[PDB]
């Protein structure tokens, strides 16, 4: 792929997302989704191999079905009220269709099956883009129509997402599938609090995006895609493994790290609405994500796995390409808990 072509494709993806963000008309939001998918399919296939082709095909099928359901919901809403503005849907059937379509776009359970496969089939850069930037548009649409959310369906999908993310992550040795299941669980956390406080949803999205960017950049810097490949990093760059262990602890929600701030806030917000059982179950379930993060930390930085002889050669060479935003991303992923009240700036 030409660098100019790749830049144009990335700009088209971002401009489709922004068109979704800035539109007041349902047709323009649908157009933004369509443009985003059209430009995003080639990016998944930059490095050509059968696995990338399969991931692109699965992604296209899922997103096209979601787009068709999205348009059907829009058309039913127009039928029952001659309105195109994205304010609040006037038909419960259209609302159910829209909720299911946006859940399929986000990958919430039980529409989660494509996320680990597509993440495993693409490179780490494509995985970073897919798991960070692709969540903005459906979440923005869901935030705009939050007052029309049926709480039962949304909360059921969120709880299923948390549970399934934990259970699926428990079984993985590939790092991309671990990241995908973490994404599913975090998306469940994001959508659990949506019918109550969209500011908490935005804060959770920001924290998750920062930690995911740090994780994927640390995985690109130490070019590992499996657990055993990552077990070799300590013998070449120990600082990377130490920072990765701290970031993994933050992703587990352990205080006083940054990852604790969203869940905490979400929990307290839910208790303001006499929701007690569900936050308790969600936290006890996120314990599973913490468990497999700790397993990765055990294999990567807290113990020293055996290495190979050829590693000596790698001792003689540095990294020619540096990621400029990795240190800031790590610091934001760990030490921003004392700045918690700043969330008032988000509303």
């Amino acid at each position: 792929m030409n660098p100019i072509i790749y830049t144009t494709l990335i700009m088209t993806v971002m401009s489709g997302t922004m068109l979704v963000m800035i539109s007041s008309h349902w047709l323009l939001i649908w157009i933004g989704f369509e443009m985003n998918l059209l430009a995003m399919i080639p990016v998944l296939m930059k490095n050509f191999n059968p696995r990338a082709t399969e991931a692109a095909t699965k992604y296209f099928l899922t997103q096209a079905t979601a787009s068709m359901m999205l348009m059907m919901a829009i058309i039913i809403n127009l039928l029952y009220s001659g309105q195109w503005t994205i304010t609040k849907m006037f038909n419960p059937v259209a609302m159910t269709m829209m909720t299911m379509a946006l859940a399929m776009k986000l990958g919430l359970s039980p529409f989660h099956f494509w996320v680990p496969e597509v993440t495993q089939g693409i490179s780490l850069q494509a995985g970073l883009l897919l798991l960070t930037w692709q969540k903005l548009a459906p979440l923005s649409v869901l935030c705009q129509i939050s007052q029309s959310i049926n709480p039962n369906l949304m909360l059921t999908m969120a709880m299923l997402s948390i549970l399934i993310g934990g259970w699926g992550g428990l079984n993985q040795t590939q790092l991309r599938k671990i990241m995908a299941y973490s994404s599913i669980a975090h998306m469940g956390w994001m959508t659990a609090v949506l019918p109550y406080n969209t500011t908490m949803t935005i804060l959770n999205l920001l924290i998750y995006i920062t930690m995911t960017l740090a994780m994927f950049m640390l995985l690109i810097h130490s070019s590992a895609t499996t657990t055993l490949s990552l077990s070799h990093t300590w013998n070449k760059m120990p600082v990377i493994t130490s920072l990765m262990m701290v970031t993994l602890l933050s992703m587990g929600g352990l205080p006083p790290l940054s990852g604790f701030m969203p869940k905490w806030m979400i929990i307290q917000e839910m208790t303001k609405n006499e929701s007690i059982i569900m936050p308790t179950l969600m936290a006890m379930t996120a314990l599973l994500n913490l468990y497999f993060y700790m397993r990765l930390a055990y294999s990567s930085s807290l113990t020293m796995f055996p290495s190979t002889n050829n590693m000596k050669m790698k001792w003689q060479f540095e990294h020619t390409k540096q990621m400029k935003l990795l240190p800031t991303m790590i610091v934001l992923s760990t030490l921003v808990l004392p700045m918690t009240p700043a969330l008032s700036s988000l509303n």
Partner: protein
Amino acid sequence: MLKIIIPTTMLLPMTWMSKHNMIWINATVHSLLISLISLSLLNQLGENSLNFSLTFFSDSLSAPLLVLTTWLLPLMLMASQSHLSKETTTRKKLYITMLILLQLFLIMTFTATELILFYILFEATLVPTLIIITRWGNQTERLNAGLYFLFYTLAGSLPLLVALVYIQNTTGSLNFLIIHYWSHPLSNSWSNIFMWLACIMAFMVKMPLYGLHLWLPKAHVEAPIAGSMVLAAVLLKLGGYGMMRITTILNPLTNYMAYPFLMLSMWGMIMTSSICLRQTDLKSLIAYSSVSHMALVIVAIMIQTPWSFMGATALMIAHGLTSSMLFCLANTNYERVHSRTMILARGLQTLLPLMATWWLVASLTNLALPPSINLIGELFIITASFSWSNITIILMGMNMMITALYSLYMLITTQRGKYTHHINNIKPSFTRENALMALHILPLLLLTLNPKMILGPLY
């Protein structure tokens, strides 16, 4: 309160800017100076607490715990510097950083005025301990231990968090002073029962309560010597402290709710004291003895009388000092013979007489010989339990006997008899080990002269 927190924070750049051969000296000297500075919080007012600011406050209960933490840091450095000799400079600095962060989190935990900040710091203590255990532990089991030590804790603490925020939604505050002054009775209902359980269970598992204690033998046995010292001396007390702060809003529910926990604590102190009689590992015996003493503390907190609270405070302080000393004593022999089996190295009094004296004094304090503060706390708890119910003495009495039966047993197993013939690498005791033993034991005997310093606010 910043006059203690800020120097503890300054310990970090000071240890990261030192030479490769001067880290231990600087860390020990300035930790001792910080302990001396913290010694000034014992000037308590009686009626109310020392309210430094909106964030921090000191109490007749918090001050001995803070002094114990600050005193335990230099002893931990002294015990650590032996087995870390072959280690690289950067990793040694990282280990010392872990210890300093643990001290900072503990001193901020013991003085926070609101329950949410207390929860945040009380959970933040988990990370340095887990890192220490899993990174500088010696055996392959350490990883498993860490997992236990993590999840057993979190399964207790996550409900509490929910309960905490729930309380602030109905009361409007989680500040301890406001919470105490505006306290209202807890009605008898399922909601109140589950709120009680959520408020109690995290501190229960941190004590640990019998039945929820399986994490402790693993974590204490597989931890390095400093990790074991801090786990036994200070961390186990957190839950105890938490209970004395949280039970002010749980009345009168505690009168009927506390029954299963009291039964578990008494029968489990009997069970763990019996377990100590058949233990092939020397560290496991000390861990189970810690479990028994903390069961006594749990009973004292549950029965909720002024004498019980005084006894609990005294017993927490005494147990911290005694257990840390016992772990250090075991670690000396482990460094000698590279094994934890009790019957491997016998007849050590013949080869190490002063270490045998230290062993005897530690064993005597462990079985609560009067007038040691261990005996003071135990006697106060026993009297309060007798007032609660006259039958309790039976269980209490049994525990006392069994305690001696295992305490002297350990001594008799390791000091008396004849030496093992083929073990020929038992060198004379170093000055460092003797000084560590003395710095453990002298404050213990000194505190007998002024017991009111460690009897808490109910004094």
